[PDB]
Design an enzyme around this catalytic site. Structure first.
Site, PDB file in Angstrom:
ATOM      1  N   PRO B  92     -10.481  -4.893   8.960  1.00 18.11           N
ATOM      2  CA  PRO B  92      -9.865  -6.218   8.834  1.00 18.11           C
ATOM      3  C   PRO B  92     -10.698  -7.177   7.961  1.00 18.11           C
ATOM      4  O   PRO B  92     -10.254  -8.295   7.683  1.00 18.11           O
ATOM      5  CB  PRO B  92      -9.755  -6.696  10.287  1.00 18.11           C
ATOM      6  CG  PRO B  92     -10.785  -5.974  11.037  1.00 18.11           C
ATOM      7  CD  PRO B  92     -11.132  -4.722  10.277  1.00 18.11           C
ATOM      8  N   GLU B 119     -16.563   0.467  17.920  1.00 13.82           N
ATOM      9  CA  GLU B 119     -16.911  -0.868  17.519  1.00 13.82           C
ATOM     10  C   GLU B 119     -16.914  -0.984  16.016  1.00 13.82           C
ATOM     11  O   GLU B 119     -16.570  -1.999  15.453  1.00 13.82           O
ATOM     12  CB  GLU B 119     -18.274  -1.166  18.070  1.00 13.82           C
ATOM     13  CG  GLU B 119     -18.265  -2.187  19.160  1.00 13.82           C
ATOM     14  CD  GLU B 119     -18.740  -3.504  18.649  1.00 13.82           C
ATOM     15  OE1 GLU B 119     -19.963  -3.725  18.655  1.00 13.82           O
ATOM     16  OE2 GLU B 119     -17.896  -4.305  18.218  1.00 13.82           O
ATOM     17  N   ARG B 157       6.515   5.699  -0.437  1.00 14.60           N
ATOM     18  CA  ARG B 157       7.810   5.109  -0.795  1.00 14.60           C
ATOM     19  C   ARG B 157       7.971   4.961  -2.297  1.00 14.60           C
ATOM     20  O   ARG B 157       9.108   4.972  -2.777  1.00 14.60           O
ATOM     21  CB  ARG B 157       7.956   3.722  -0.163  1.00 14.60           C
ATOM     22  CG  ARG B 157       8.428   3.713   1.272  1.00 14.60           C
ATOM     23  CD  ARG B 157       8.785   2.327   1.709  1.00 14.60           C
ATOM     24  NE  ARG B 157      10.092   1.871   1.211  1.00 14.60           N
ATOM     25  CZ  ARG B 157      10.267   1.040   0.184  1.00 14.60           C
ATOM     26  NH1 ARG B 157       9.226   0.613  -0.523  1.00 14.60           N
ATOM     27  NH2 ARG B 157      11.485   0.627  -0.143  1.00 14.60           N
ATOM     28  N   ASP B 172      13.087  -4.673  -3.305  1.00 11.21           N
ATOM     29  CA  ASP B 172      12.469  -4.927  -2.030  1.00 11.21           C
ATOM     30  C   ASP B 172      12.014  -6.324  -1.906  1.00 11.21           C
ATOM     31  O   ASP B 172      12.129  -7.107  -2.806  1.00 11.21           O
ATOM     32  CB  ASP B 172      11.189  -4.128  -1.926  1.00 11.21           C
ATOM     33  CG  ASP B 172      11.411  -2.734  -1.541  1.00 11.21           C
ATOM     34  OD1 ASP B 172      12.399  -2.459  -0.873  1.00 11.21           O
ATOM     35  OD2 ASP B 172      10.584  -1.906  -1.906  1.00 11.21           O
TER      36      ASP B 172
END
Ligand SMILES: Nc1ncnc2c1ncn2[C@@H]1O[C@H](C[C@@H](N)CC[C@H](N)C(=O)O)[C@@H](O)[C@H]1O
Ligand SMILES: Nc1ncnc2c1ncn2[C@@H]1O[C@H](C[C@@H](N)CC[C@H](N)C(=O)O)[C@@H](O)[C@H]1O
Lengths: 242, 248
Positions: B92, B119, B157, B172
């Site tokens: 993240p 972790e 995709r 899209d």
């Protein structure tokens, strides 16, 4: 029991990723999470179990039929019993999922998650039955299955006693992590972590977090209400860097 | 063949969710996608050593050792052959994934994704071996397996012939900095709601103009932030200004 989750999807077997693994699997075992799937394919009138239908106005691809979704959704609302269930449609058009959104979502007792497919689902179904739309990010996936699992995983982490501060809790990224060996291929673990002084390890970690947050994600700090102590460790990190 | 993917994860069998279902499964069968897993627990010093160990400096959790990860990465690199492989750690703290990021990654010959557990992984593994850190969004997940799957599904995709007649990448959300328009299917009337007449009887130019206006209006209503980056033509301004005034 803590949170009940019903998923409307044409690939319920994909949900083994969360039912058999990790905190979601543990949460199910511990009785904190109830997980169920409702396959629109079971709610079909034809021999080949058709869920798609061509789109009005032309255009490429297919759209999901209203009736098979309605069928699967009705049974899911029934299985929710008397729990106040929030109907979510996983979609790129939805509210962007963030840790703040995850906390909101964690207060719910029941969630019905609709996993779309193809070009998407009929707008009238969304207008009739969908309480809210959520996106996991500004990219396009082939279905709502992975997004629904991302959402379930993130929320479960906040279920009391499921885990056994984070990267977006208090608008700050996470500090680096070190483990054995003490030195690996002429690279050694910072001395501050080899010392045993709690305040010194907390100080360093909190500085390293502030430091990475400013380097990679300065936007997370504009929202942040940085303390006098945090304002010193970030300043130190900035000026003591090449 | 078109794209080779190697995942480094302590849960290789979790990836059955993408190898056995949807577009990724079809791409694997059509030869477009190669997907392989590499458990770090098989590259430890000895069987008695776990992938994780205690974190230096205390605190709650465990941290993934560098040697097992190094072993799985080394073996995954060998199997890629002479393909130029990009080594991604899902984190993240990484670059936020977006459709444009997906387009860039689709041009890669080989990707080795590192799914972390516990972790975190040891910082020295990242420093020495990671080429890029990619985030799927500003939220914390328990592992990098779902983020790795999200990445493979998004990229797959865009591989030629992977969508078929089910959907189109040319049309899209986010491709041209706008959200997509609503979709409608059979029947023409359902729950006392009729499919927009322009879709039922309009010509190609009317349908195009309605679809663009809807995409603009939905973007303005839910994601104004997207309009701040992407400028509007005179036509788009007029389609939008009219959407706004006719909202209710
Ligand atoms: N980024 C995402 N966030 C939440 N759900 C997603 C996301 N991407 C795809 N989906 C789901 O995947 C399904 C199929 C998509 N290919 C359709 C996307 C739609 N045509 C659009 O561009 O907005 C959608 O109906 C959603 O349920
Ligand atoms: N939002 C995300 N995007 C990409 N990967 C993620 C994301 N959230 C978690 N991860 C993965 O999950 C792994 C470990 C988790 N226990 C994350 C908690 C960890 N202490 C952290 O704050 O990063 C991380 O190493 C990542 O591989």
């Amino acid at each position: 029991s803590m949170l009940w989750v019903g998923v409307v999807s044409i690939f319920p077997e994909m949900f083994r990723a969360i039912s058999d693994y990790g905190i979601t699997s543990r949460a199910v075992k511990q009785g904190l999470l109830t997980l169920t799937c409702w396959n629109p394919r079971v709610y079909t009138e034809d021999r080949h179990q058709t869920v798609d239908d061509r789109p009005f106005g032309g255009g490429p691809g297919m759209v999901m039929k209203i009736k098979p979704l309605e069928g699967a959704l009705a049974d899911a609302r029934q299985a929710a019993g008397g729990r106040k269930a929030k109907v979510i449609y996983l979609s790129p058009q939805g509210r962007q999922l963030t840790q703040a959104g995850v906390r909101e979502l964690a207060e719910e007792e029941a969630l019905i998650l609709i996993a779309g497919r193809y070009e998407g689902i009929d707008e009238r179904f969304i207008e009739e039955h969908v309480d809210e739309e959520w996106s996991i990010g500004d990219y396009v996936l082939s279905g709502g299955e992975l997004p629904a699992m991302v959402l379930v995983d993130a929320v479960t982490r906040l279920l009391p006693g499921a885990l056994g501060e984070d990267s977006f809790t208090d608008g700050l990224l996470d500090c680096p992590h070190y483990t054995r060996p003490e030195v690996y291929a002429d690279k050694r673990v910072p001395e501050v972590l080899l010392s045993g002084n709690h305040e010194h390890i907390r100080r360093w970690r909190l500085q390293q977090a502030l430091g990475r947050t400013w380097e990679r994600r300065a936007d997370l700090l504009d929202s942040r209400s940085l303390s006098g102590e945090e304002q010193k460790l970030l300043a130190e990190y900035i000026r003591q860097r090449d």
